[PDB]
Amino acid sequence: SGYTPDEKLRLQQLRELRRRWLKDQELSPREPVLPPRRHSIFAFTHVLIPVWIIHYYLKYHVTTKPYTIVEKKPRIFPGDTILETGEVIPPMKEFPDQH
Amino acid sequence: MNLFSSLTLVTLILLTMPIAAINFNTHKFTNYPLYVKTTISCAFITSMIPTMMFIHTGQEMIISNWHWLTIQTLKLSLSFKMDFFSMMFVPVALFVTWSIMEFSMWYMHSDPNINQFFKYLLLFLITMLILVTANNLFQLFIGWEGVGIMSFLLIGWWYGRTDANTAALQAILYNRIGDIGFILAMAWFLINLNTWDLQQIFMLNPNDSNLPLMGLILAATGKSAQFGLHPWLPSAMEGPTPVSALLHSSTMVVAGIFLLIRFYPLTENNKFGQSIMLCLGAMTTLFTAMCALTQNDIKKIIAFSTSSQLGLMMVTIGINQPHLAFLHICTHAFFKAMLFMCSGSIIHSLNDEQDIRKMGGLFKAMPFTTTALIIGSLALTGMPFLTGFYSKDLIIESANTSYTNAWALLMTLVATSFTAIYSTRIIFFALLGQPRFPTLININENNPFLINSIKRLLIGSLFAGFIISNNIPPMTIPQMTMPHYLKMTALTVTILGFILALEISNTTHYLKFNYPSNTFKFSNLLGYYPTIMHRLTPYM
Amino acid sequence: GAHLARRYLGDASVEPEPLRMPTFPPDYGFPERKEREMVATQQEMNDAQLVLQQRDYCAHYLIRFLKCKRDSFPNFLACKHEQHDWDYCEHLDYVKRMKEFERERRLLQRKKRREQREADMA
Amino acid sequence: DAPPLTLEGIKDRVLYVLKLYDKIDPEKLSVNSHFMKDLGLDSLDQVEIIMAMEDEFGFEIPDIDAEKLMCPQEIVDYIADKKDVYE
Amino acid sequence: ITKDMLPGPYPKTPEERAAAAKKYNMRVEDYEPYPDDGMGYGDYPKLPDRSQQERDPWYDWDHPDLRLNWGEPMHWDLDMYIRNRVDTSPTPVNWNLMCKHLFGFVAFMLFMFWVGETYPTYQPVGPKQYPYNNLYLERGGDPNKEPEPVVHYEI
Amino acid sequence: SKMELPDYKQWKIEGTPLETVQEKLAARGLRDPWGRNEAWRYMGGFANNVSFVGALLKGFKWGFAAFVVAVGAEYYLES
Amino acid sequence: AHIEPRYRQFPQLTRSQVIQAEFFSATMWFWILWRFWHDSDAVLGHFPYPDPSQWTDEELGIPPD
Amino acid sequence: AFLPSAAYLTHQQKVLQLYKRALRHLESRCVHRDKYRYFACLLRARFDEHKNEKDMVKATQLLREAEKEFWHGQHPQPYIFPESPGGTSYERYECYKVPEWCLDDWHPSEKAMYPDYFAKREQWKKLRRESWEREVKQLQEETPVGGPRTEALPPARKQGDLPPLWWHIVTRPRERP
Amino acid sequence: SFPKYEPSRLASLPTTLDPAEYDISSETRKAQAERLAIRSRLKREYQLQYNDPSRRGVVEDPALIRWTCARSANVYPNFRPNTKTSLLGALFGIGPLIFWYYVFKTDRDRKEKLIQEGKLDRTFNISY
Numbered sequence A: 001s002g003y004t005p006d007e008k009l010r011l012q013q014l015r016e017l018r019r020r021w022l023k024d025q026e027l028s029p030r031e032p033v034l035p036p037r038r039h040s041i042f043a044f045t046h047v048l049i050p051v052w053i054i055h056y057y058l059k060y061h062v063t064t065k066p067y068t069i070v071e072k073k074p075r076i077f078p079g080d081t082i083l084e085t086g087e088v089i090p091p092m093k094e095f096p097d098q099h
Numbered sequence B: 001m002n003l004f005s006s007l008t009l010v011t012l013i014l015l016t017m018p019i020a021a022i023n024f025n026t027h028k029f030t031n032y033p034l035y036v037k038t039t040i041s042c043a044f045i046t047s048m049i050p051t052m053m054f055i056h057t058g059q060e061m062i063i064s065n066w067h068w069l070t071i072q073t074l075k076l077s078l079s080f081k082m083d084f085f086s087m088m089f090v091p092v093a094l095f096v097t098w099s100i101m102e103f104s105m106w107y108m109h110s111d112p113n114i115n116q117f118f119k120y121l122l123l124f125l126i127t128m129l130i131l132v133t134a135n136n137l138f139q140l141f142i143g144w145e146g147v148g149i150m151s152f153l154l155i156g157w158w159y160g161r162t163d164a165n166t167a168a169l170q171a172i173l174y175n176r177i178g179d180i181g182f183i184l185a186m187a188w189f190l191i192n193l194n195t196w197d198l199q200q201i202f203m204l205n206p207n208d209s210n211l212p213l214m215g216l217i218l219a220a221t222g223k224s225a226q227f228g229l230h231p232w233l234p235s236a237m238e239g240p241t242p243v244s245a246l247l248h249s250s251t252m253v254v255a256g257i258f259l260l261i262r263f264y265p266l267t268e269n270n271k272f273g274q275s276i277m278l279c280l281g282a283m284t285t286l287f288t289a290m291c292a293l294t295q296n297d298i299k300k301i302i303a304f305s306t307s308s309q310l311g312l313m314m315v316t317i318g319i320n321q322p323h324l325a326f327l328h329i330c331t332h333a334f335f336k337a338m339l340f341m342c343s344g345s346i347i348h349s350l351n352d353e354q355d356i357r358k359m360g361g362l363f364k365a366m367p368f369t370t371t372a373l374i375i376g377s378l379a380l381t382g383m384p385f386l387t388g389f390y391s392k393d394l395i396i397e398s399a400n401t402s403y404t405n406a407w408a409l410l411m412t413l414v415a416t417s418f419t420a421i422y423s424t425r426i427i428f429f430a431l432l433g434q435p436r437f438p439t440l441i442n443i444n445e446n447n448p449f450l451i452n453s454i455k456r457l458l459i460g461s462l463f464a465g466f467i468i469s470n471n472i473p474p475m476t477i478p479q480m481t482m483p484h485y486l487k488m489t490a491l492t493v494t495i496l497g498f499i500l501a502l503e504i505s506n507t508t509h510y511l512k513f514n515y516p517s518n519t520f521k522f523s524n525l526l527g528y529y530p531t532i533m534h535r536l537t538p539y540m
Numbered sequence C: 001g002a003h004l005a006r007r008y009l010g011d012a013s014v015e016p017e018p019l020r021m022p023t024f025p026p027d028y029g030f031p032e033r034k035e036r037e038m039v040a041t042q043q044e045m046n047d048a049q050l051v052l053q054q055r056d057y058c059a060h061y062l063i064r065f066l067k068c069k070r071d072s073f074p075n076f077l078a079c080k081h082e083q084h085d086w087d088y089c090e091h092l093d094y095v096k097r098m099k100e101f102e103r104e105r106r107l108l109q110r111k112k113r114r115e116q117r118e119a120d121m122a
Numbered sequence D: 001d002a003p004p005l006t007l008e009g010i011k012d013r014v015l016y017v018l019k020l021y022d023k024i025d026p027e028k029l030s031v032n033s034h035f036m037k038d039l040g041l042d043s044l045d046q047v048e049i050i051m052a053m054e055d056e057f058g059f060e061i062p063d064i065d066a067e068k069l070m071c072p073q074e075i076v077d078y079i080a081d082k083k084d085v086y087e
Numbered sequence E: 001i002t003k004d005m006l007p008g009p010y011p012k013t014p015e016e017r018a019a020a021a022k023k024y025n026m027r028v029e030d031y032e033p034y035p036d037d038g039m040g041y042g043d044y045p046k047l048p049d050r051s052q053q054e055r056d057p058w059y060d061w062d063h064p065d066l067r068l069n070w071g072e073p074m075h076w077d078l079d080m081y082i083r084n085r086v087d088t089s090p091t092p093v094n095w096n097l098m099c100k101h102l103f104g105f106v107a108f109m110l111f112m113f114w115v116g117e118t119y120p121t122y123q124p125v126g127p128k129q130y131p132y133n134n135l136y137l138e139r140g141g142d143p144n145k146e147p148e149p150v151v152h153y154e155i
Numbered sequence F: 001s002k003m004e005l006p007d008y009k010q011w012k013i014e015g016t017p018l019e020t021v022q023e024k025l026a027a028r029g030l031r032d033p034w035g036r037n038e039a040w041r042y043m044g045g046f047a048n049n050v051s052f053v054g055a056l057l058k059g060f061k062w063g064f065a066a067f068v069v070a071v072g073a074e075y076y077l078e079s
Numbered sequence G: 001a002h003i004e005p006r007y008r009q010f011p012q013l014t015r016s017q018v019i020q021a022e023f024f025s026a027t028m029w030f031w032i033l034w035r036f037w038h039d040s041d042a043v044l045g046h047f048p049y050p051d052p053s054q055w056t057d058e059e060l061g062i063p064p065d
Numbered sequence H: 001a002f003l004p005s006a007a008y009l010t011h012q013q014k015v016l017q018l019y020k021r022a023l024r025h026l027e028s029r030c031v032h033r034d035k036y037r038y039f040a041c042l043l044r045a046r047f048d049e050h051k052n053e054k055d056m057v058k059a060t061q062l063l064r065e066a067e068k069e070f071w072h073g074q075h076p077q078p079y080i081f082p083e084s085p086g087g088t089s090y091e092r093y094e095c096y097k098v099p100e101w102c103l104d105d106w107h108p109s110e111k112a113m114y115p116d117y118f119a120k121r122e123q124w125k126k127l128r129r130e131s132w133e134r135e136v137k138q139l140q141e142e143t144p145v146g147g148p149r150t151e152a153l154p155p156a157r158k159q160g161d162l163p164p165l166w167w168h169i170v171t172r173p174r175e176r177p
Numbered sequence I: 001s002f003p004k005y006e007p008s009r010l011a012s013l014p015t016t017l018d019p020a021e022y023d024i025s026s027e028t029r030k031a032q033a034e035r036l037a038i039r040s041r042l043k044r045e046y047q048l049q050y051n052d053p054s055r056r057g058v059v060e061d062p063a064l065i066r067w068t069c070a071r072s073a074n075v076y077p078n079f080r081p082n083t084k085t086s087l088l089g090a091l092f093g094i095g096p097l098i099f100w101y102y103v104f105k106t107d108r109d110r111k112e113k114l115i116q117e118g119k120l121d122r123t124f125n126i127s128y
C-alpha cells in the first residue's frame, strides 16, 4: 500500500515549508544592489607589442650570444644562385630517360 | 631569421597572456571565454606564418634563449626546437583547441566556474606546446607532467562526484607508471650520453640503446594508453566533454606517440624497439577496438576509438615509418575532436544522455550533427579522399610491404575492420532507427558557437588531409608498387567490416532473445582487464 | 604472397631468404653486365640534405621535385609531373629489385635441378 | 535546456501518460484517483505506472518510494519534491 | 568522549563481550572480533568485509559520499573500502573465469606475436641498393680510409 | 510558461510496429496495454527513418550535380 | 524567436541549419568524386604490378645446364 | 534487507522489486521499444501465471528459482539513469550544493548587495529558533521509551507548529544550484 | 541447468543469491527489529544534535573517533609474541631488505668487476 496518514501529513507540511523556502529564494527586481562603479586594441596589445618585445629580445640579447638561435642552413640545389658568394651552382647531368 | 623565431615565441607568450589576465583581476569579466577564444584564434594565425615559411623552404631552427642551469656538464637552457614536428603539430593543436573552446562557450555555458575551466584548458594548451616544442628532456618532462596534472584537474572537474576523482587518480597512477620509464630514459641519456638535448642524443648515435627505448615505450604506454596501461582513457570520459574532446582525443593522448616519433633516429637503428612497438601497438589496436564493439556509452566508444587509433600509430612507428604516424596524428586530431563534439551535442540535446540505447531518430532531428558525425565516421574508417585516407590507408600500404611481424599485420587488419564495425554501430544506434529518448524534445543546435565550431573542424575533416599531405616535403620514399590484392587490402576489409556489422545491426530488429555468451560478456566488461587489476593490485 | 607459403609450408631449400642474398656472383649467368650509373653527384645531394633512405640510385628526380616544391610556392599542386617522374623511377627500381628476387629464385631452382641430376647420375 | 517545470505542467504530463494507458478510462481519471481503490489496478500495473513515470521524466524513483505512490497526486508531489518546482 | 568508549584490549569473558557490543553500538550476537594473535586489533569488530558500493545508494545516509550512519562501527579499512578505491561488488562473470580469460588471451596473443616474429612477412624483392660504396661517407665513414667497393649492377 | 500538450487520442498504433507486437501477443492470447504511450516514437516527423546506405548517401544528388557542372567547366575551359 | 521545445513530436527546424547540413553533405560528395576523378590511383593503384613468372631466362641470365 | 522505515522486504515487495529490476535488465537487453514491449508483455504474463499461488513456501521456492533466472538472464551494463546512482551525471552538482549556514558568515558589504534576501532569511532563522524547543518537547513525549523504534518522524499536530527535525530538509540545496 | 555465482573476496556474493535473505524465522525477525531499533535510535540522537541551533560546531562521532584511536593508539599494547606475528615481522620486515641487498651487491660487484677490467662502455660518462 501507500503511505500512512502521519507520513502524508508530514510530507504535506514539509512540502509547504519547502515551497515557501524555494519561493523565498526568488530575488527582488532591485537585487542585486550593486555598489556604485579601441576596436582593434586586441591586435595591438596582444600581437604588435609582444612582437616588438620579443624581436628586441631576440635581436639584441639572444642573437648577440653564440649558438642561441642556430638556424639550419638552406637546402642547396643544382641550379641555385648564391647571394653571398655569387657563384651559380652547376646543374645535373642529362638524364638516362625512362619515358 | 628575424620573423620565424619571433612569431614562434609570440604564439607561446600570447597563450600565456590570459593566464596573467585571469590572475590580475578584481572585477567580473566581460566574457573571458570569448577573450581566450579570440586569443587562441590569434595564436593560430600567428603560428601559421612559420608553418608557411617551413612549407616554402624547410627552415628548421632552435631558440636556446635562456640559459637556466649549468650542472657541471649539463647546460639546461630554455631551448625550443622548430622542426617539421613542431611546425605541423602546433597549428593543428591550436585549430582544434580554438574549435573546442568555441564549442565550450556553449557546452559549459551554465557553469559558474567557467573562468576556472577556460584557465585550466589554456594551461593544458600551454603545457602541451611546452611538450611539443621541447628540445631537452627536462623541458619535455615539464610539458609531460603538465599535461598529466591538467589531466588530473580536468578529469576531476565536477569534484563532488566520487567517480570523477577516482578516474583522475587512476589517470595519474597510469601516467606515473609511464613516468617511471621516462625518468629511466632521462637517466640513461644523462649517464651514457651526458645530455638531455636532442641534438647530442641524435649525434652521438647509441648502439646499445635497448634500455632507453624500453623506457620511452613504457612512457608512451602510460601516456598514449597502449596495452597494459590503457584503462585510464576509458575511465577519463568522466570529465566534461570538451576535456575528453581536446585532451583525450587529439592533444594529450598523442604525446607518447609524439615522444616515439621525436626519437625516430634511435628507433630506426634498433630492430628490437621496432618489434616491441609493433607487437604492443597491434595488441592495443586489437583489444581496444574490440572492447568498443560492445559498449553503449558513446564517450566510451569514442575513447576506445581514439585508443585504437593510437595503437595503429604505435604500429606505424614499429614499421619504421615515423612521418606517416605523425601525419596520422595531425589527421586524426580534426575528425576525432569533431566526433567528440558531435557526441557532446547529442548528449546536451538529450539532457545529459550518453547511452546510445536511448538515442535514435536524430537523422533529421539534428541534421548538422548528423552530417558532421557521418563525415567524421567516414573519415575514421578510411573513406577514400577524406582526411583519414591520406594517412591511415598509407599505413596499411607500408604495413603490408615490409619485413614485418605477420601476426601484427593481421591484427592491424582485424582492427581496421573493427573500426568500421563500431563506426556503423555509432551511426545505427545514435542517428538511425527510432527515438528511444524521453518525451519532452528539447533538441536544439541553433547556436552560432556550435555551428561555427563544428563547421571549422568539418572544413578540416574535408580538406586538411589533402592540404597537409601535399604541403609536406618527402622525408621517406613511399611504397607505390604492390600487387592489386595488397593495394586494395584496407578498403576491402573496411567494407567487409561495414557489411558484417550491418548484419549485426539488422539482427537487433529480430524478435528473438539470446543469452549472451563469453564473447559479449568478455568484451562488454572491458576485456576483464580493469576488473582484476583495480581490485587485486591495490589490495596487495 | 605465395612466397610466404612456398617458404614456410613447402620446402625452404629453394626459396631465397630475405636477409642474406644475393648468394651468387653478379656475373654468374651475365656476360658483360654493366654497372649502375649514378646520376646525382655526391656533393649535390650532400647539399640537398636528403634522407639516407632517399640517397639511392634515383635521387636526382627527388632533387628536381624538391626544387619544384620550393620554387612553386604557394601553388602546392603545381609539381605533379616531377612527382610522377620520381614515382615512375621508384617503380622501375622496385621492378629491378623484383628481378633480383626472381633471379635468385631461378638460380636456386637451377641448383635444385643440378644436385638432383648429380644424385641420379652418380 | 532543461525547462522549468510547473505543477500544472507535471500534473498534465502525468495524466497524459496515464490517459495513454489502456487500463485507465480517461473520464474517470482524476488527481485523487487511487489505483488499487478507484481504478482497481494490480500491483504489477502500479510498478509499470511508476516505470512509465521513470521513462517519462528521465530519472529513477527508488523502490522504497515506488511501492508507496498510489495516486497521481502523490506522483506529482514526489516529482515536485525531487525537482524543486515553484521556486 | 572518555575512556570506556575507546577501543580497548581483546575481550575474553562474555560479559566483556556484551559490554563491548554495547560500546561499539551493535548487537552482541553479530559482534565478532578479529582473531587474537597479537596484530593489535583489540576488541574491534570484524565487519563482513563488504565495500561502500554495496551499501544502499538511495538510502538517506548520514555520510552520503561514504554511505554510512552515525555511531555505526566502521570497518577497519574504512579508508580503503571507499568508492575511490577497491570494491567488493559482484560481477556477472565469476572471478576465476575472468582470471582464466584474461591470462589466456594475453598469453595466446603474445605467443602468436612471438610466432609471427619467428615467421616474418615480406616482399618478393632484394635489398635496397645504395651508391657510393653503399653510402660509406653518408653513414659516417672516415675519409682517411677507403672501404671495399660496393658496386651494384643493372638488371 | 504554460506549455500545451497535444491530444492523447491521436496516438493510435495503426501503421506502427506496435500493431505487429499486438498481433504476436494476440496470436498467443495476450494484450499490450502500453501501445499508445509508445505510439509517438514511430509516428509523425519521426517516421520512416533512412537506411544506413541512405544515411551515408545524404547530399549525393547536389554533390553529383556540382561534380558534373564543375567537370564540364574544366572540360570546356581547358580548350 | 528561439526553438521552443515540443512534446512527443518532431521539433522545429531552422532553415539555416538544414541548408548548411545539406551543403556540407554535398561538399563531401563533390570533394570525394572530384578527387576520385582527378587522382583515381591512390585508391586503385599507381603502376601496373608485373608478373615474375613471365620473365624470360635471357633477361635474368639463366643459362640452361 | 536494508530499509529506513521497515526492517524487511515482504514477499510481495520482493516480487515487485524482482519484477521491476527484471524489466529494467530486460530493457537493457531489449534496446528497441517494440521488441521490449513484446517481451515486457511476455514477462508480465509469466509473472501473472504464478500470481494466485497460496502456498508461501512454494512461492519462496519459485522466487528462489526466479532469482536464478534473473541472475542468468541479466545484462553486464544495465541502463542507469543519469541522476540515479551509478549513472554518468550522478552527484555531479554536489560541488555546487553549498550549505545554507555559510550565508551566516558573509561580510556585511556583500550582505548589503542582497538586503531583502537576508532580511527575509532572518525570519526563517527566527521561526526555526522559536520552533525548535516546541518540536523538541513534541519529540520527547511522542517517542516511546527505549528510543524510537523506526526512523519515521511524526508530523506536527497543533495549528501553528512545525514538524520536528525539519530545517535541513527544507533548507537543503537544489538539484541545480 | 544454470551457472551458480561463485563468490570472491574482491567480488562478494549479492543480496539476492544469499540464502540468509530468504529466511523467515523468528530470530531473523527479532534481529532485524533490534538492528532497526539501534539504527533508529542512533539516527534520532544524530539528527537532534545535527539540527540543534545552539550547537555551532562539530557533531562528534564516537565511531569515527573510535576508528581513529583504533588505527593508531591500540597498536603496541595488543602486540604479543607468537608464531604468526613474529614470522610476519621477519618475512615482511627484513626479508625484502636481504633481497634488495644481495641484488644490489651482485649488480655492483658485476659492474665494478667490468670496470676494473676495462670492459664496460663508459665513453661519454663524465656526469656521475
Ligand SMILES: CCCCCCCCCCCCCCCCCC(=O)OC[C@H](COP(=O)([O-])OCC[N+](C)(C)C)OC(=O)CCCCCCCCCCCCCCCCC
Binding pocket: A053, A056, A057, A061, B065, B066, B067, B068, B069, B076, B077, B078, B079, B136, B138, B139
Ligand atoms: C611582460 C613584461 C615584460 C617586460 C616589459 C617591459 C620591458 C621592455 C620590453 C623588453 C624586455 C626587457 C629587455 C630584454 C630582456 C632582458 C635581456 C637580458 O639581458 O636578459 C638576461 C637573461 C638572459 O639569460 P643569460 O644567459 O644572459 O643569464 C642567465 C644567467 N647565468 C648565465 C649565470 C645562468 O635573462 C632573461 O632574459 C630571462 C628571460 C626568461 C624568459 C623565460 C622565463 C621562463 C621561466 C621558466 C622557469 C623554469 C624553467 C625550467 C626549464 C628551463 C629549461 C631546461
Ligand SMILES: CCCCCCCCCCCCCCCCCC(=O)OC[C@H](COP(=O)(O)OCCN)OC(=O)CCCCCCCCCCCCCCCCC
Binding pocket: B163, B166, B167, B170, B173, B174, B177, B180, B214, B217, B218, B221, B227, B228, B229, B530, B533, B534, B535, B537, B538, E083, E084, E085, E086, E087
Ligand atoms: C613496455 C612495457 C609495458 C608493460 C605494461 C605492463 C606493466 C604494468 C602492469 C599494470 C600496472 C597497473 C595496474 C595495476 C594497478 C591499478 C590501480 C588502479 O588503476 O586502480 C584503479 C582504482 C579505481 O578504478 P575503478 O575501480 O576501475 O574505477 C571505477 C569507479 N569506482 O583505484 C583504486 O583502487 C585506488 C588505489 C590506491 C592505492 C594503490 C596502491 C598500489 C599502487 C601500485 C603502484 C604500481 C607501481 C608499479 C611500478 C612498476 C616499476 C617498473
Ligand SMILES: *C(=O)CCCCCCCCCCCCC
Binding pocket: B400, B485, B486, B488, B489, B492, B493, C001, C002, C003, C004, E121, E122
Ligand atoms: C602473399 O600473399 C603475402 C602477402 C602478405 C601477407 C598476407 C596478407 C593477407 C591480407 C591482405 C589481403 C586482404 C584482401 C582482403
